[PDB]
Design a protein around this ligand. Structure first.
Ligand SMILES: O=C(O)CNC(=O)C(=O)O
Ligand SMILES: [Mg+2]
Ligand code: NI
Ligand SMILES: [Zn+2]
Length: 331
């Protein structure tokens, strides 16, 4: 068995290996990358996502989200308070302000310490989940707006044509902006490219151990767990590495820098934080290996998780028994 300790693997594809996206994912899996839940891909030196980032300031962040925490430093939830619209240039200036800017630090590990010590005492503002792309249309390799769609994958594997679309999303971050512990919708893959700016630190639980994280979460967030049998689908709970280690939960960590891709694999729980002003692009995708995970994915039906239009068909075809209850949660 390849990668039996479920370490995060880092790949350096050549420009020739960068041509065929599906083939390279399958290669990474042949080497055991998925066992970690997360892999890093450093693009060949010849590649670029676009020519420059000098002209992005007028992108609008219609609904910036202030991430307000509750709990203790290592075990907390966050809610998202909607703020007034602002441009990316306005948001960059805000991120760099004395109130929001990254503190002085020695190295990534020092900054990580500071994050976990102090995150709860601040409420950073995240420009998350913005439909759009920063890849140039002429970028032919690993262009996240040009990937094979999940609907087409389901049709290819299973024979059933379904409605829905699959487009990327932009994320504008600042120091302490946080992504809560989650797997993807329908336990899909995700791919995330850090276009510019400061790093993003990731934590991940191997897919084979995801239920250990779920059991801890039920213990740590006992009200939330009574409310919903899949409350991590709400994407609000944080648990620190220290707490994970105290509770024996297997996990790994890695820091993504600008110019690097990360792939999350089906049922790979992940969480993390941004170091300072940055912009990432991410999208979900599927492969043949996903289908079995999609069929088994948990679902939130309490009403909180509320998701895209295109998840309807995935539930309807892959999980027909659950469909009625899940759709009630959507309406
Ligand atoms: O970058 C973020 O805020 C969150 N990203 C992801 O969870 C991802 O790419 O799967
Ligand atoms: Mg612009
Ligand atoms: Ni994710
Ligand atoms: Zn729920």
């Amino acid at each position: 068995a390849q990668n039996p300790n479920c370490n995060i693997m880092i790949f350096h594809p050549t420009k020739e290996e960068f041509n065929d996206f599906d083939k390279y994912i399958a290669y990474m899996e042949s080497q055991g990358a998925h066992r970690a839940g997360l892999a890093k891909i450093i693009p060949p030196k010849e590649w670029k996502a676009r020519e420059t980032y000098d002209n992005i300031s007028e992108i609008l962040i219609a609904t910036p989200l202030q991430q307000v925490a509750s709990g203790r430093a290592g075990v907390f939830t966050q809610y998202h308070k909607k703020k007034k619209a602002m441009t990316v240039g306005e948001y960059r200036h805000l991120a760099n302000s004395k109130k929001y800017q990254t503190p002085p630090h020695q190295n990534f590990e020092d900054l990580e310490r500071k994050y976990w010590k102090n995150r709860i005492y601040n409420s950073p503002i995240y420009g998350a989940d913005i439909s759009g792309s920063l890849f140039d249309e002429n970028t032919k390799q690993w262009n996240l707006g040009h990937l094979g769609t999940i609907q087409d994958l389901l049709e290819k594997e299973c024979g059933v044509v379904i409605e829905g679309v699959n487009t990327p999303y932009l994320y504008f971050g600042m120091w302490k902006t946080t992504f809560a512990w989650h797997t993807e919708d329908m336990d899909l893959y995700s791919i995330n490219y850090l276009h510019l700016g400061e790093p993003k630190t990731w934590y991940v639980v191997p897919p084979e151990h995801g239920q250990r994280l779920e059991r801890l979460a039920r213990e740590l967030f006992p009200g939330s767990s009574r409310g919903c049998g899949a409350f991590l689908r709400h994407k609000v709970a944080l648990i620190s590495p220290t707490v994970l280690k105290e509770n024996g939960i297997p996990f790994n960590r890695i820091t993504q820098e600008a110019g690097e891709f990360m792939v999350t694999f089906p049922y790979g729980y992940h969480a993390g934080f941004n170091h300072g002003f940055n912009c990432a692009e991410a999208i979900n995708f599927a492969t043949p290996r996903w289908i079995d995970y999609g069929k088994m994915a948990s679902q939130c039906s309490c009403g909180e998780a509320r998701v895209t239009f295109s998840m309807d068909a995935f539930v309807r075809i892959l999980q027909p028994e659950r469909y009625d209850l899940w759709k009630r949660g959507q309406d």
